[PDB]
């Protein structure tokens, strides 16, 4: 991971509507960035916490930006349907996966961080109830 206070590096992927959507698109909002893939069990198990958080704060200048490294688009879509994880979900193009992971120095998954409205990383290692409580702290 990167140090808190770091500027979050650029990310672009393709969303479920077939459009390119970047982290920069959410400037002005707090954004939980969730790096994951379908075969990451613990990533999937965070879903209820992510949904609870998304629902509580989505009207107050907050969103979730999910970023998958799935090699297969089918696996990614199946997971989203199974999890009902219908926030902003993008899939990295193959040629971008290594660059994104290196830029965020991602070693392990899940990797869930909180980015502020100016694009600075303000929290990391977010899991479970701590995820909700951390977002509450920054958004409220
Ligand atoms: N601007 C940083 C970006 C690279 C970076 O942050 N690397 C990771 C390790 S791959 C790091 O040192 N992270 C510190 C942390 O996560 O606290 C640098 O060049 O050192
Ligand atoms: Cl930085
Ligand atoms: Cl970006
Ligand atoms: Cl989407
Ligand atoms: Cl990491
Ligand atoms: Cl993390």
């Amino acid at each position: 991971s990167l140090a808190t206070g770091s500027v979050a590096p650029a990310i672009t992927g393709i969303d479920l509507k077939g459009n390119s959507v970047s982290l920069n698109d959410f400037k002005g909002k707090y954004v939980l960035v969730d790096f994951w893939f379908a075969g990451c069990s613990w990533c999937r198990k965070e879903t209820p916490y992510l949904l609870k958080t998304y629902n509580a704060f989505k009207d107050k200048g907050f969103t979730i930006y999910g970023v998958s490294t799935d090699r297969r688009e089918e696996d990614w879509k199946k997971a989203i349907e199974e999890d009902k994880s219908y926030w902003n979900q993008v899939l990295l193009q193959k040629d971008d996966v290594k660059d994104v992971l290196e830029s965020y120095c991602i070693v392990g998954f899940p990797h869930i961080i909180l980015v502020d409205p100016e694009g600075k990383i303000v929290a990391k290692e977010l899991r479970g109830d701590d995820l909700y409580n951390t977002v509450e702290k920054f958004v409220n």
Side-chain angles (χ1 to χ4, degrees), residues 1-51 53-140:
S1 59
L2 304 169
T4 64
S6 294
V7 175
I11 307 171
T12 310
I14 310 302
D15 76 0
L16 289 172
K17 290 184 170 163
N19 297 314
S20 281
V21 178
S22 70
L23 177 56
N24 182 61
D25 287 337
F26 303 104
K27 285 270 173 36
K29 293 182 182 191
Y30 280 99
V31 190
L32 211 54
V33 184
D34 177 20
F35 299 87
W36 72 290
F37 48 94
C40 172
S41 278
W42 216 263
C43 301
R44 314 279 305 267
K45 288 173 75 167
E46 292 301 321
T47 294
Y49 305 95
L50 295 160
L51 196 56
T53 302
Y54 183 62
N55 280 334
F57 302 108
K58 59 188 177 190
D59 298 322
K60 309 175 170 200
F62 173 76
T63 193
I64 303 177
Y65 182 60
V67 182
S68 174
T69 62
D70 271 293
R71 296 217 344 110
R72 304 200 291 133
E73 187 175 306
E74 45 192 287
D75 293 340
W76 174 61
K77 289 184 298 189
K78 287 173 172 164
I80 289 174
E81 192 281 326
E82 291 170 343
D83 297 347
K84 297 298 179 177
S85 47
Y86 299 119
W87 44 80
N88 294 287
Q89 295 279 25
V90 300
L91 181 62
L92 295 178
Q93 310 208 227
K94 178 179 148 66
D95 280 355
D96 289 332
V97 170
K98 193 177 173 190
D99 294 324
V100 171
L101 297 180
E102 288 179 3
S103 78
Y104 279 84
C105 183
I106 296 168
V107 176
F109 299 77
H111 191 70
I112 308 178
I113 60 174
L114 185 57
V115 177
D116 75 10
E118 285 92 43
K120 199 172 69 173
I121 300 173
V122 295
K124 48 177 180 184
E125 291 292 333
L126 301 182
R127 307 282 190 276
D129 293 315
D130 191 49
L131 194 153
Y132 185 97
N133 301 338
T134 298
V135 170
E136 184 177 28
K137 168 187 188 295
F138 280 96
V139 173
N140 276 344

